[PDB]
UniProtKB/Swiss-Prot annotation:
Lineage: Eukaryota, Metazoa, Chordata, Craniata, Vertebrata
Effect of residue 114 to S: In sporadic cancers; somatic mutation
Native source organism of the sequence: Homo sapiens
Effect of residue 50 to S: In sporadic cancers; somatic mutation
Effect noted on mutating residue 137 to L: In sporadic cancers; somatic mutation
Effect of residue 142 to Y: In a familial cancer not matching LFS; germline mutation and in sporadic cancers; somatic mutation
Protein name: Cellular tumor antigen p53
GN (gene name): TP53
Length: 193
């Protein structure tokens, strides 16, 4: 099971999010209280990368999903039988992968040869001039448990910064729920606090 320990490392790596609120028209919203993102299926999901020093060119950023619940944590997170079979290919992402990146032609997808786990990687790019952070647009393509089934575990996204040789530079994470009405579900989960 991949590590989920937060690790800022030598470049001072951490994540930032937009403050989008919970209006009905919102397609993507982050709960600071829950450290949890609520997303419509396949909609743009901005995640910000913040560093204290700029990692070198060739640095890469990987996203991997795991199941939070102990009884399901060794299971590979992948799309349910419905979403796997959807004609929603962008010609890059394998159809089983839950997490995609949009708007990046250098995106790379991995089926791990040893663990079988899926991940998606892009090149780390520094903030543009006069910007304080780098944004990656994720798309989540399934909530895993869309059709039911034993596994109702929350899903955690782990974001790792790695160098061009695969050395871990930094790590962070957030929970994610893909749903039709993200604003409503955020409000409801926060009420349960
Ligand atoms: As989102
Ligand atoms: Zn699904």
């Amino acid at each position: 099971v991949p590590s989920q320990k937060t690790y800022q490392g030598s470049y001072g790596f951490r994540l930032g999010f937009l403050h989008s609120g919970t209006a009905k028209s919102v397609t993507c919203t982050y709960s600071p209280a829950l450290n949890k993102m609520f997303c419509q299926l396949a909609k743009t999901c901005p995640v910000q990368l913040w560093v204290d020093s700029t990692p070198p060119p060739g640095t890469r950023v990987r996203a991997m999903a795991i199941y939070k619940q102990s009884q399901h944590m060794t299971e590979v997170v992948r799309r349910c039988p419905h979403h796997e079979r959807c004609s929603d290919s962008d010609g890059l992402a394998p159809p089983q992968h839950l997490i995609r990146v949009e708007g990046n032609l250098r995106v790379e997808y991995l089926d791990d040869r040893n663990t079988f786990r899926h991940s998606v990687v892009v090149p780390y790019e520094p903030p543009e001039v006069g910007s304080d952070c780098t944004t990656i647009h994720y798309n989540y393509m399934c909530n895993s448990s869309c059709m039911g089934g034993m596994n109702r575990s929350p899903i955690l996204t782990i974001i790792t910064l790695e160098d061009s040789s695969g050395n871990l530079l930094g790590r962070n994470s957030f929970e994610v729920r893909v749903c039709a009405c993200p604003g409503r579900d955020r409000r409801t989960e926060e009420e349960n606090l």
